[PDB]
Amino acid sequence: CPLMVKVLDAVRGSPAINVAVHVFRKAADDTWEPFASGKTSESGELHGLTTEEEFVEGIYKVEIDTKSYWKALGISPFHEHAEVVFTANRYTIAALLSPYSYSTTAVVT
Amino acid sequence: CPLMVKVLDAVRGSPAINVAVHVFRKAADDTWEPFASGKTSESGELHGLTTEEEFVEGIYKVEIDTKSYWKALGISPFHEHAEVVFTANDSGPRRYTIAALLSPYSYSTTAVVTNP
Amino acid sequence: CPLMVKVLDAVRGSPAINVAVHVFRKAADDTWEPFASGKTSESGELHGLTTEEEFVEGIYKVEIDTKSYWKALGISPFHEHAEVVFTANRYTIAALLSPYSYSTTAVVT
Amino acid sequence: CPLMVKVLDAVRGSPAINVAVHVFRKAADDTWEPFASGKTSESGELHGLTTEEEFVEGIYKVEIDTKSYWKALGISPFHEHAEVVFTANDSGPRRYTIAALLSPYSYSTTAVVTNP
Numbered sequence: 001c002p003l004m005v006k007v008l009d010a011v012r013g014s015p016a017i018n019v020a021v022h023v024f025r026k027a028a029d030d031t032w033e034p035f036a037s038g039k040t041s042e043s044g045e046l047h048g049l050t051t052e053e054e055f056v057e058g059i060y061k062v063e064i065d066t067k068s069y070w071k072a073l074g075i076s077p078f079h080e081h082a083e084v085v086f087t088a089n090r091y092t093i094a095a096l097l098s099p100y101s102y103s104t105t106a107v108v109t
Numbered sequence: 110c111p112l113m114v115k116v117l118d119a120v121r122g123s124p125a126i127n128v129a130v131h132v133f134r135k136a137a138d139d140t141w142e143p144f145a146s147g148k149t150s151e152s153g154e155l156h157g158l159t160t161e162e163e164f165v166e167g168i169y170k171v172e173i174d175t176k177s178y179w180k181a182l183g184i185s186p187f188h189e190h191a192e193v194v195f196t197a198n199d200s201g202p203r204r205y206t207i208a209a210l211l212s213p214y215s216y217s218t219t220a221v222v223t224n225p
Numbered sequence: 226c227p228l229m230v231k232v233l234d235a236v237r238g239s240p241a242i243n244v245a246v247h248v249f250r251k252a253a254d255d256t257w258e259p260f261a262s263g264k265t266s267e268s269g270e271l272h273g274l275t276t277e278e279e280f281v282e283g284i285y286k287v288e289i290d291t292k293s294y295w296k297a298l299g300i301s302p303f304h305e306h307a308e309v310v311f312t313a314n315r316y317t318i319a320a321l322l323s324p325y326s327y328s329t330t331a332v333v334t
Numbered sequence: 335c336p337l338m339v340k341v342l343d344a345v346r347g348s349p350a351i352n353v354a355v356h357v358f359r360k361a362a363d364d365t366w367e368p369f370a371s372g373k374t375s376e377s378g379e380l381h382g383l384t385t386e387e388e389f390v391e392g393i394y395k396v397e398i399d400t401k402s403y404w405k406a407l408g409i410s411p412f413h414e415h416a417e418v419v420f421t422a423n424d425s426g427p428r429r430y431t432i433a434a435l436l437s438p439y440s441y442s443t444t445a446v447v448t449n450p
């Protein structure tokens with residue numbers, strides 16, 4: 001697929017499983033229009049978000065619902081979510097998660 | 110001050126100087142209202158954004174203009190910006206340091222939260 | 226395999242390809258004995274380092290030759306290498322690379 | 335001072351206090367010779383490790399005892415330690431800040447290098 005999301009748990013040394021992910025595309029309004037969503041799998045991956053035809057050049061945002069994930073683990077987190085915003089010009093967006101920290105990386109091949 | 114932003118360049122091993130930072134607070138109607146803004150200094154720090162009085166409980170967004178920083182250095186980076194969104198002061202007033210470490214295709218953000 | 230190494234390039238948004246990796250096992254001497262090595266593939270992965278039988282409990286070190294990688298790219302780096310040292314009690318050791326920074330993460334499933 | 339170490343806890347969003355740090359320098363015979371040591375403070379900083387005179391050109395190793403820090407907090411972490419290995423001062427004297435951000439199954443290290 002044109003776009004993949006991968007999430008990791010730095011506390012537990014594991015894939016971050018069942019994490020909600022929402023993808024938005026910026027409308028001509030300058031508002032975000034919902035585009036695709038899903039939850040990460042047991043391998044911490046989310047696949048099948050979009051297709052090559054659909055995934056045109058644009059400014060896209062991916063919101064990962066980190067706070068819900070931490071809440072289910074009974075660990076109190078800092079962020080509301082982790083947002084990745086990029087201009088789409090294969091994208092793997094990877095996120096590594098900690099309660100008071102996250103990093104996000106793009107692997108574009 | 111209650112909120113501080115610090116930015117680092119992971120490519121040069123330096124502070125990230127002259128980076129724009131825009132801060133927003135979630136309104137009653139769920140909109141993001143402009144709250145404060147500034148540029149990082151020679152040390153890559155931004156101080157004086159707000160005050161103990163002004164910085165009330167709320168959901169806040171700190172948006173760091175990473176793209177402009179990379180572009181001025183000749184790089185076309187992946188991200189539009191780095192944005193940090195968090196609930197502040199709901200246990201009482203705290204001091205927040207929002208740190209960001211920048212790479213062209215990656216960034217990390219960390220919060221150091223302390224009690225006056 | 227029991228042990229996998231994965232390397233990413235934060236400057237280029239890509240797998241870190243052809244990066245030298247050496248694995249050591251701590252001897253009763255308190256010295257490191259060479260154990261396995263390889264170079265990362267076009268996908269930035271290094272597989273087939275060891276086998277379950279061979280990979281007994283121990284304290285292991287994985288040295289990733291980051292400086293050579295940066296040198297080939299004509300970007301001057303800070304570290305001599307990135308070293309990961311752990312007690313082995315499936316391990317994926319992932320490294321994300323920048324010239325003056327790296328992070329390493331373990332995913333243990 | 336020429337070399338400073340700073341450590342942060344990515345789980346609690348605080349400085350990592352009372353963390354042991356051991357510094358080594360590569361000898362002529364290729365062995366690692368003990369060079370300096372200390373513990374991080376309340377701010378998670380370690381200052382005063384060395385001096386402009388002492389801190390000559392060389393390959394240096396900074397080993398941060400992450401395992402003991404996690405264990406005292408009840409966590410069994412992945413890493414034995416975080417170790418940073420670098421060539422120092424070969425362009426002339428510099429000031430080095432070695433920063434580490436800690437998680438139980440992950441860590442990152444960054445260097446901020448500046449010119450007196």
Ligand SMILES: O=c1c(O)c(-c2ccc(O)cc2)oc2cc(O)cc(O)c12
Nearest residue numbers: 092094095096103105107319320321328
């Ligand atoms: O892309 C990936 C990635 O980034 C990480 C990772 C490494 C360091 C980080 O800081 C964050 C994530 O693990 C991965 C593991 C995979 O099997 C595949 C990947 O593509 C990634």
Ligand SMILES: O=c1c(O)c(-c2ccc(O)cc2)oc2cc(O)cc(O)c12
Nearest residue numbers: 206208209210217221433434435442444
């Ligand atoms: O100098 C600092 C620094 O380099 C970092 C840092 C940022 C991102 C990381 O991933 C790791 C460390 O945090 C800091 C946090 C502070 O409150 C004060 C600092 O001076 C630093």
